[PDB]
RNA sequence: AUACUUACCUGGCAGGGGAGAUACCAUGAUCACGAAGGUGGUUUUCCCAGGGCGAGGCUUAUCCAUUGCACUCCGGAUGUGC
């Protein structure tokens, strides 16, 4: 609930393949700022979710405000901040610990 | 029903993966101990020559469950072609 470099998105349509989903998320989510990476998995735990890593928390915060509920494959998007910094975020800060 | 002699009617010969290495078996080699080799085995590397085991892996739908906070690929089963 506390702002983060990374936003967490869930309630995504599970039929879309990883490369398809990464592509359209980059397209959809680039409108708000420079994106370093979009990580998707289709595993049981990780299917239906994506992490968009922004350079600035403010793009993440603004992205959260705008896309909350956004229609995506017949489903409103749910967005949160990542609970923890992403390794590429944490190494840039030098906060990273295994 | 069996064997013997004759006439008539039918019909193509050689064979059983192949090339190397075998110290060991067989051939118990016709000259005062002996062969080599070869032939027929057993052992041993390959052009893989066809098969049997389908573990593992690749492509895509059906069914079931998941609202999941990851950054070392990977939820379970059936079907199509490898």
From Swiss-Prot:
The chain holds residues 6 to 103 of 282 of the full protein. U1 snRNP is composed of the 7 core Sm proteins SNRPB, SNRPD1, SNRPD2, SNRPD3, SNRPE, SNRPF and SNRPG that assemble in a heptameric protein ring on the Sm site of the small nuclear RNA to form the core snRNP, and at least three U1 snRNP-specific proteins SNRNP70/U1-70K, SNRPA/U1-A and SNRPC/U1-C. Interacts with SFPQ; component of a snRNP-free complex with SFPQ. Interacts with IVNS1ABP (via BACK domain); the interaction is indirect. It comes from the Eukaryota. Changing residue 10 to V: Abolishes RNA binding. Belongs to the RRM U1 A/B'' family. It comes from Homo sapiens (Human). It is found in: Nucleus. Residues 5-84 form the RRM domain. Component of the spliceosomal U1 snRNP, which is essential for recognition of the pre-mRNA 5' splice-site and the subsequent assembly of the spliceosome. U1 snRNP is the first snRNP to interact with pre-mRNA. This interaction is required for the subsequent binding of U2 snRNP and the U4/U6/U5 tri-snRNP. SNRPA binds stem loop II of U1 snRNA. In a snRNP-free form (SF-A) may be involved in coupled pre-mRNA splicing and polyadenylation process. May bind preferentially to the 5'-UGCAC-3' motif on RNAs. The modification N6-acetyllysine is found at residue 55. This is U1 small nuclear ribonucleoprotein A. Changing residue 8 to F: Substantially reduces RNA binding. Transmembrane segments: none annotated.
